[PDB]
From Swiss-Prot:
The gene is LGALS3. A beta-D-galactoside binds at residues 69-75. GO terms for biological process: eosinophil chemotaxis; epithelial cell differentiation; innate immune response; macrophage chemotaxis; monocyte chemotaxis; mononuclear cell migration; mRNA processing; negative regulation of endocytosis. It is found in: Cytoplasm; Nucleus; Secreted. Galactose-specific lectin which binds IgE. May mediate with the alpha-3, beta-1 integrin the stimulation by CSPG4 of endothelial cells migration. Together with DMBT1, required for terminal differentiation of columnar epithelial cells during early embryogenesis. In the nucleus: acts as a pre-mRNA splicing factor. Involved in acute inflammatory responses including neutrophil activation and adhesion, chemoattraction of monocytes macrophages, opsonization of apoptotic neutrophils, and activation of mast cells. This is Galectin-3.
Length: 138
């Protein structure tokens, strides 16, 4: 597989119709997963499943600009389970990232960072065995 944390270059950043696919398996007794779509030091799209925040499972999304986190967007639908294989698909659409897990739509996150073609790396981290991470234009 791949060594976590893993950096996936996104050559020429992202653009609508670009689909990024992350395949792995959650470790037993997981605490967190994180995808970080970065524009340089900024994080355009942070997607952060938390397995135990006050004994609740929640996905936190956010953007970091000039080292400051913005307003979190939170989703209680939580498709991940400790120990189980998952697929995350992030499809760039004109106004948002659209995320589906295991072929089921999960959430969308409106673009706050506008220079899509400068979001040139995806960091993948957390309590997973990572199998593959790739992109394709659809
Ligand atoms: N920025 C913080 O330190 C906030 O701390 C609060 C109390 O622990 C939490 O309720 C907030 O979610 C964040 S934690 C911080 O969140 C950002 C996303 O907004 C990112 O997930 C960071 O890795 C995490 O430390
Ligand atoms: Mg279409
Ligand atoms: Mg923000
Ligand atoms: Mg911008």
């Amino acid at each position: 597989p791949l060594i976590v944390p893993y950096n996936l270059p996104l050559p020429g950043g992202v653009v609508p119709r670009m689909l990024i696919t992350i395949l792995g398996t959650v470790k037993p007794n997981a605490n967190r997963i994180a995808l970080d779509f970065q524009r340089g030091n900024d994080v355009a799209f942070h997607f952060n499943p938390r397995f135990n925040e006050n004994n609740r499972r929640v996905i936190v999304c956010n953007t970091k600009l000039d080292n400051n986190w913005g307003r979190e967007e939170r989703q209680s639908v939580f498709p991940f389970e400790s120990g189980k294989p998952f697929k995350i698909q992030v499809l760039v659409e004109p106004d948002h990232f659209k995320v589906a897990v295991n072929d089921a739509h999960l959430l969308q996150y409106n673009h706050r960072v506008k220079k899509l073609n400068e979001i040139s790396k995806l960091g993948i981290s957390g309590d997973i065995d990572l199998t593959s991470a790739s992109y394709t234009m659809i």
